[PDB]
Amino acid sequence: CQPSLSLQRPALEDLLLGSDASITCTLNGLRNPEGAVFTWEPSTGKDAVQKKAVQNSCGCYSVSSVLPGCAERWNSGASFKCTVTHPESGTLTGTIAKVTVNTFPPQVHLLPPPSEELALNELLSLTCLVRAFNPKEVLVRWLHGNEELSPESYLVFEPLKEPGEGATTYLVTSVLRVSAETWKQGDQYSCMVGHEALPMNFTQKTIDRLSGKPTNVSVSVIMSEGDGICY
Amino acid sequence: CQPSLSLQRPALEDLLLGSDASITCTLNGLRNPEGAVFTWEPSTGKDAVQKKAVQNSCGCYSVSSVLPGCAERWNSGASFKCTVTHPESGTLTGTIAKVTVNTFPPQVHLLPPPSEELALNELLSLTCLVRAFNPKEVLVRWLHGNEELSPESYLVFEPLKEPGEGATTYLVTSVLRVSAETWKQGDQYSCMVGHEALPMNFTQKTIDRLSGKPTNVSVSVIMSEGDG
Amino acid sequence: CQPSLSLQRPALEDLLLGSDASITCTLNGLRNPEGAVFTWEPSTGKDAVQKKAVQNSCGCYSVSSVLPGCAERWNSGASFKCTVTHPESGTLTGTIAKVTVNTFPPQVHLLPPPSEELALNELLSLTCLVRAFNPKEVLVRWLHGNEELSPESYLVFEPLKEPGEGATTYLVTSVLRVSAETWKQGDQYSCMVGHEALPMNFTQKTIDRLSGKPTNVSVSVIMS
Amino acid sequence: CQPSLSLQRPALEDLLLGSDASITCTLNGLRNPEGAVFTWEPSTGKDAVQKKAVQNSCGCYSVSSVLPGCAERWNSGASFKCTVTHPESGTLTGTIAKVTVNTFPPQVHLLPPPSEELALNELLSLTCLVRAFNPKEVLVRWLHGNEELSPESYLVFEPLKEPGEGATTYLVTSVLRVSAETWKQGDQYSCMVGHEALPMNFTQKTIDRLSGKPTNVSVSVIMSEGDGICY
Amino acid sequence: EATILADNKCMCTRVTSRIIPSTEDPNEDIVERNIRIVVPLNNRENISDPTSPLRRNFVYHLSDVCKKCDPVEVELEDQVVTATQSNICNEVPETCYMYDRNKCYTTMVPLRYHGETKMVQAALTPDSCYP
Ligand SMILES: *[C@@H]1O[C@H](CO)[C@@H](O[C@@H]2O[C@H](CO)[C@@H](O)[C@H](O)[C@H]2NC(C)=O)[C@H](O)[C@H]1NC(C)=O
Ligand SMILES: *[C@@H]1O[C@H](CO)[C@@H](O)[C@H](O)[C@H]1NC(C)=O
Ligand SMILES: *[C@@H]1O[C@H](CO)[C@@H](O)[C@H](O)[C@H]1NC(C)=O
């Protein structure tokens, strides 16, 4: 349990959906509570707030300070450095930034309910599989019609590194439990995903009992001439 | 660094993939690895292993006490007990047992790959969705044909408690990446899952390239004019 | 106002098909609308009819007469000579004849309407391409149901000399606007083309919605 | 040959291809070759030019002047006026205005060779039909395989008013004689048509050996997925 | 009465579908689609360039048929946000079979007037590309 420094990155929720992202400079492994000094190099925006010392499972202390009002700098790929003086002995520094430069925009796929779970007219599982995102953190929400569903109704599974060779990618899954009654009525359900290396902010996909698997599809091919113009 | 005693059940892998099950009684809160002498009462059977060389980041000590031969009493649903007496704390005691009150046979479904991956080449994504009972522990494996695939090829998530009321159940999902070529060529893939209550230990569901309800697709051609 | 004599060739209209074709002898560049004497030396025995004098925008006069009796000798290569005594002074002379030295019969080609129009119904453009007349004059008419259509329904474009060497020919085009319904229902359409150097009094071509066509397109629709 | 004034529009080629748009103001009838006077109502600073008078067949004199730079004004639908002083008399006046009411662009349809000559190879006739356009001037050019073809080899006919009722419209037909060899090899020909009522100055249609249909034709039509998720 | 799930303008492929009741029970219901394709018999490999061979091969990826590339708003608690609706629209332009009547298709031609060559932009769809 020796003194050590680390920087806790801003949450994706604040960067994409919220209004004020912040960075936290944290020392841990400290025997002497309080008395530590936390100085940010980019002393702009709003003053950092020093938080109270808290004991961990070993009785050592965690002491940190948070710098708010930093979303505008991160949206440009900027950087932050923290220099700290231990409450006991030494000078320690570190840096972070919001720039990885080897990202893969997400691919959001939706899997409709299994036949085994919809033939009974009970409850359905809509599975959202978001694939490929190099900075591992995802914002997953679900929509029922045009309204957001409460987060207590989602099971969102943490990101895991994908196996194999090549560029690193990760999967995230979430399951929404849906009443077969509203699926029968035709209510639309959609998965909403956030990830910074992606344009126009967020991404979404929607499914219902029309997009799902059909039965006895009718296909009509028409040969055309004219000018080859579709009207 | 306060004293405590707990019991850790055998891994499900130890009770379904053959039998090599043991219960680990953990003796915590030690300031000396020599620790304490502990006793046993899992029915009978003189077999104990004491590992003393264990430390936390706090620098404080823990002892792992292994009792082999526990599988039969997990299959019966019987209890086990562990006791120790430390110079640091006096006597610590605890028990462990299989939970049957909220134990329900599982419910497993498979999701064929999404459409975009089928239109494309490269790779696909087969998803195995598993519903777990409250005393939940799941072994998720996959088959390519009749061969077991290495865990290094899976992506398996931890269980999360489902919303609702009246019972506690969890969901897990796992994804297997499948080459488009073997998909189109007819190689079969399957999700095997091991669970406590399942009478035959393991269950299996399968995905083919033809899985699902087959359809009468009606196709016709119109040579008439009108374009579109 | 420079005096000059010219003879006007008989026009195809009335020639290969009408009776009593005629030739006109005309003096231009006159200051006196009287006294011109149009003597005719084909010696058919017919008296040319003197016509009323007319003026240009500048006041110059033009005076002419018309001889009846043409086709029977004109199409035979006869040379009709005209000498005119000038209203004011002197005489002028010239001749007219069918020139059979280097003539070319026509070729008539009809083009069905384009698919771009057929797809829209409305009216279709049936076009008659008439290639390779030696001189410029041509009679272009159409038939609808084998009945002649009025001149008001035509769009016939002036003869223009054909490009190329080793030739002396003209090209003419005509467009007929035809309701898509009559085309789809099978009304017959024809292009009639008349010209001097010819085996008959009517060379024509016909078109319909139908012909031997490359239209059996095999459409292999695949569910994959 | 009585004294008179008339005005003449710019050439359509000057309007659509070049930049030297101009208007011509012409006197006619007068008996005096001596210089007359031209006044341009727009009253531009640019040098309006009196050029060279011409004697007609009857000895009548034609005089004219040109106003340059009539570009944006015609594209904007602006009118022009000319007042002239005859050497023998007083003043005459007149105007030109662009049609901004029935500005209908043509429809262009191209036709392959007729079958009679096509069966004989030798020399083929390709034809271009320009129909249902109102203003009385059209620019028609014939192209080769992505290469302009010399005017001495194509035959363009004058516009001719269409039959029936409606806005005044004209047809134009043109014939390009084509070596049967270039046809058999599939050399690509095209009709280029230009006009001021077309939002773009020009439109193009093409002919080649496959503009019709071979006697052995098939099309591969594949519907992929079919039972997939239709979003 | 059918719901239109997809209406593409490059590959006319109106994909309607509707809930057709079954013959077994009034509760059980069936779904059926109407993939109405329109294949051009006269169009080049590419429609942006008129000097390409005729098109005798057509493939219709359903995902590409039912696409969505029009951002939408979403009431995420108290922050309305713009929403990409697919993971496909990403431009290289996509392969296109038929002309979109509501898009302008043109070609550049070297025409020689008054003695010099000029690059003139000519319409391929003259009945569209208006203001
Ligand atoms: C359709 O072909 C055209 C012809 O090249 C392509 O589009 C033009 O390509 C040139 C050369 O790269 C560019 O300068 C132009 O900007 C392009 N046109 C436009 C409107 O952008 C096009 O790539 C072809 N389509 C496909 C799928 O191959
Ligand atoms: C096609 O329709 C017949 C009609 O009786 C039915 O028996 C058959 O099962 C159907 N096939 C599929 C694949 O739906
Ligand atoms: C159809 O194909 C056959 C193949 O021999 C051919 O004889 C015929 O001319 C083609 N066209 C039509 C319209 O049948």
Author numbering:
A (entry chain C), D (entry chain A): 237 to 467
B (entry chain D): 237 to 464
C (entry chain B): 237 to 460
E (entry chain J): 3 to 93, 97 to 136
Sentences from the paper on this structure:
Secretory (S) Immunoglobin (Ig) A is the predominant, mammalian mucosal antibody; it is a polymeric antibody assembled in plasma cells that link two IgA monomers and a single copy of the joining chain (JC) to form dimeric (d) IgA (and to a lesser extent, higher order polymers). The pIgR uses five Ig-like domains (D1-D5) and a cytoplasmic tail to bind and transcytose JC-containing antibodies to the apical surface of epithelial cells; there, the pIgR ectodomain, called secretory component (SC), is proteolytically cleaved, releasing the SC-dIgA complex into the mucosa where it is called SIgA. The IgA CH3 contains a C-terminal extension called the tailpiece (Tp), which along with the JC, is required for IgA dimerization and subsequent pIgR binding. Our work describes the structures of mouse SIgA and its precursor, dIgA, which lacks the SC.
To investigate SC’s contribution to the conformation of SIgA, we determined a 3.3 Å average resolution cryoEM structure of dIgA, which contained the same components as SIgA, except for SC. The dIgA structure revealed two IgA monomers arranged similar to those in SIgA; Fabs were disordered. The centroid axes of FcAB and FcCD were bent 98 degrees relative to each other (compared to 97 degrees in SIgA), and the centroid planes were tilted at an angle of 19 degrees (compared to 30 degrees in SIgA). These results suggest that the bend in SIgA is conferred by JC binding to heavy chains and/or interactions between the Tps from both antibodies. The 11-degree difference in tilt between the two structures suggests that SC binding can influence the conformational relationship between the two IgAs. Aligned individually, the structures of the heavy chains and JC were largely superimposable with equivalent chains in SIgA; however, differences were apparent in regions that are bound by SC in SIgA. In particular, TpD, which forms part of the SC D1-JC interface in SIgA, adopts a different conformation, and the three C-terminal residues are disordered. The three C-terminal residues of JC (Tyr-Pro-Asp), which bind SC D1 CDR1 in SIgA, are also disordered in dIgA. While SC may play a role in stabilizing the conformation of SIgA, the dIgA structure suggests that SC binding induces relatively small changes in the bent and tilted relationship between the two IgAs. In the SIgA and dIgA structures, two of the four accessible sites are occluded by JC wing interactions with CH3A and CH3C.
